[PDB]
Amino acid sequence: LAASLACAL
């Protein structure tokens, strides 16, 4: 989940 937030942004 954490990585998905950074990736998206």
Side-chain angles (χ1 to χ4, degrees):
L1 291 153
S4 82
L5 171 64
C7 178
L9 289 165

